[PDB]
């Protein structure tokens, strides 16, 4: 079965940037529901196994009667698992190779941060802003709807911000760009490095 | 210019079903923002005018370069303006003709309630649950994404529930069902009758 991973720090470790009550519901309620629903969907078709990253890379392989529910809850599970690991109570620095890849893709770091901030601002409704590695090994900023994940288009995400309202409403209310800025404070760039390394090597 | 209509009651009027603070952010920030954005798009084409209900009934007729912004913000404005009129601090009752059409399409009021509750609850991500008049004059429950509106498909809304998280997170957190059950205590059935009469009387 899919399991709910633990937060690898205390619920309040990201304060004042993300508030402990949000971390608690976001993980114990929202995330747990994605895992519970993904298990129920998968229980229905044991023959397909449970490797979500493989199943959701090509959604039409998933039998029709559970497809949208797996996209939604199976995607909710993967997006959130990735998200907890990209957050750090301790400040970190963009790694040399990650930084170099950025200048190359965007021209400078501030250009990236601005392209990223804007994909996150203008994602209308519920969804996620992403930094991804191309099938060409290049970086792109994108944004997806709801729990849709870029791995469904063969893109490898190395950074991700959740812009569903539940992620920021208790701390920032309507002011999503305040929450976006706060995110840059608590990114775990070591996770980003590892994801990006894993992106290139498995290619 | 599109104007932000005033709430037709005090902000704390829907208490304890909807909290004051939410009414306040929801109208003063969320709806104001759609109104502002809708106007910025419209001003780029003064020739197409300001009749949002006509423009959004055929989206395709809207110049490509403001079409998405119009759908989202224009849609945002209609749905919300409709939403404030549908809420009532006084418990009202279902008008006889409305009750009868609900009995006909659904079996009983409570059947309708469960069905509208199902659409409101399973809408994944941001959106709206609706009771609409068919092209054939029949009632149907549906839901839509984000700020999409059933008038875009030649359906006439007579009941609407915002299921965006900003509509309910302050008072109910992740438990959208408690929000939905509460919405039924504050429905203005007189706004529903009136919309229902209007839908039948333009065909
Ligand atoms: Fe989330
Ligand atoms: Fe709303």
UniProtKB/Swiss-Prot annotation, chains A, B:
Annotated Fe(3+) binding sites: 26, 80, 162, 166
Cofactor(s) essential for the protein: Mn(2+); Fe(3+)
Cofactor comment text: Binds 1 Mn(2+) or Fe(3+) ion per subunit.
Any one cellular-component term (Gene Ontology): cytoplasm
Keyword Iron appears in the UniProt entry: yes
Record carries keyword Chloroplast: no
Name the UniProt record assigns to this protein: Superoxide dismutase [Mn/Fe]
Organism of derivation: Streptococcus mutans serotype c (strain ATCC 700610 / UA159)
């Amino acid at each position: 079965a899919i399991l709910l991973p633990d937060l690898p720090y205390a619920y309040d470790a990201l304060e004042p940037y993300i508030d402990a009550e949000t971390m608690t519901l976001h993980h114990d309620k929202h995330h747990a529901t994605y895992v519970a629903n993904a298990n129920a969907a998968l229980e229905k078709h044991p023959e397909i196994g449970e490797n979500l990253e493989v199943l959701l890379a090509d959604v039409e392989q998933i039998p029709a009667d559970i497809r949208q529910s797996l996209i939604n809850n199976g995607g909710g599970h993967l997006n959130h698992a990735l998200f907890w690991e990209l957050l750090s109570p301790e400040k970190t620095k963009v790694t040399a190779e990650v930084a170099a890849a950025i200048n190359e893709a965007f021209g400078s770091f501030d250009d990236f941060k601005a392209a990223f901030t804007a994909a996150a601002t203008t994602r209308f409704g519920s969804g996620w802003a992403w930094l991804v590695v191309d099938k060409e090994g290049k970086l792109e900023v994108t944004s997806t709807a709801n729990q849709d994940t870029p791995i469904s288009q063969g893109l490898k995400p190395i950074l991700a911000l959740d812009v569903w309202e539940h992620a920021y409403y208790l701390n920032y209310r309507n002011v999503r760009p305040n929450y976006i800025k706060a995110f840059f404070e608590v990114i775990n760039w070591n996770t980003v490095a590892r994801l990006y390394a894993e992106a290139l090597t498995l290619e």
